[PDB]
């Protein structure tokens, strides 16, 4: 129903956490190369997963490959998840086909990518005043579960 996309993810445990999370809320996961890690079976199993958990995972050679993929697939909206905007994750009206795009742990999303999208499709999780940024998988968790809430948790156990 909606997808999650990591731009050049750097830290493996984060991507592990985000794979569990996508299974939990039923999102597909997009990893835009280059990655700071391999999905080697031995590291994947050490973190309590296996090859079947990596079915929702699609790799792309670069950002433009990722855009070409979405166009040739169906209707979509990209949301740029960044500290560098004024609009909250709760003020966006989410819908089937949306893509939540997240920046790398260190540099964050490139200015060009964020600027390619209108204000309405840029979203910041509120933070205490003396705070620089959330851990990547925490940001994905928060924004993913706000989108899912707005979609009435379509497809959840007992719901």
Ligand X SMILES: Nc1ncnc2c1ncn2[C@@H]1O[C@H](CSCC[C@H](N)C(=O)O)[C@@H](O)[C@H]1O
**CA gap 156, 104 in Å, rounded:** 30
Which one among 139, 141, 144, 147 touches ligand X, defined by CB under 6 A?
A: 139
Binding residue count for its own copies, defined by CB under 8 A? 42
108 interacts with, out of ligand X, its own copies, none, CB within 5 to 8 A per kind: ligand X
CB 109 within 8 A of CB 124: no
Count Cα atoms within 13 angstroms, Cβ side, for 13. 2
**CA gap 73, 58 in Å, rounded:** 13
Which one among 46, 88, 95, 107 touches its own copies, defined by CB under 8 A?
A: 88
The residues pairing with 80 across neighbouring beta strands, listed in sequence order, are 101, 122
Binding residue count for ligand X, defined by CB under 6 A? 17
Based on the shown chain and the rule CB under 8 A, indicate whether residue 128 belongs to the binding site for its own copies: yes
125 is in an annotated binding site: yes
**CA gap 72, 104 in Å, rounded:** 25
* CB closer to its own copies out of 67 and 138: 138
Sequence-distant (6+) residues with CB within 8 A of 69 are 30, 58, 60
Which one among 86, 93, 112, 118 touches its own copies, defined by CB under 8 A?
A: 86
Of residues 23 through 52, those in contact with its own copies by CB under 8 A are 23-26, 48-49
* CB closer to ligand X out of 74 and 115: 115
CB 99 within 8 A of CB 67: no
Contact residues: its own copies, CB under 8 A: 13, 16-17, 20-21, 23-26, 48-49, 53, 86, 88, 90, 125-135, 137-142, 145-146, 148-149, 153, 155-159
């Amino acid at each position: 129903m909606f997808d999650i996309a990591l731009y050049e993810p750097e830290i493996a445990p984060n991507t592990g956490n985000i794979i569990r999370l996508c299974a939990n809320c039923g999102a597909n996961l997009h990893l835009i190369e280059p990655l700071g890690f391999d999905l080697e079976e031995k590291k994947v199993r050490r973190a309590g997963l296996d090859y079947h958990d990596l079915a929702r995972v699609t790799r792309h050679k670069n950002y433009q490959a990722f855009l070409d993929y979405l166009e040739q697939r169906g209707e979509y909206r990209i949301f740029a998840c960044t500290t560098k905007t004024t609009g909250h994750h709760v003020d966006a009206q989410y819908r089937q086909g949306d893509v939540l795009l997240f920046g790398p742990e260190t540099r964050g999303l490139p200015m060009e990518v964020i600027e390619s999208l209108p204000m309405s499709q840029r979203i910041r999780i509120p933070m205490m005043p003396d705070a620089r940024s959330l851990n990547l998988s925490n940001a994905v968790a928060i924004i993913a579960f706000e989108a899912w809430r707005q979609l009435g948790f379509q497809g959840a156990k007992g719901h």
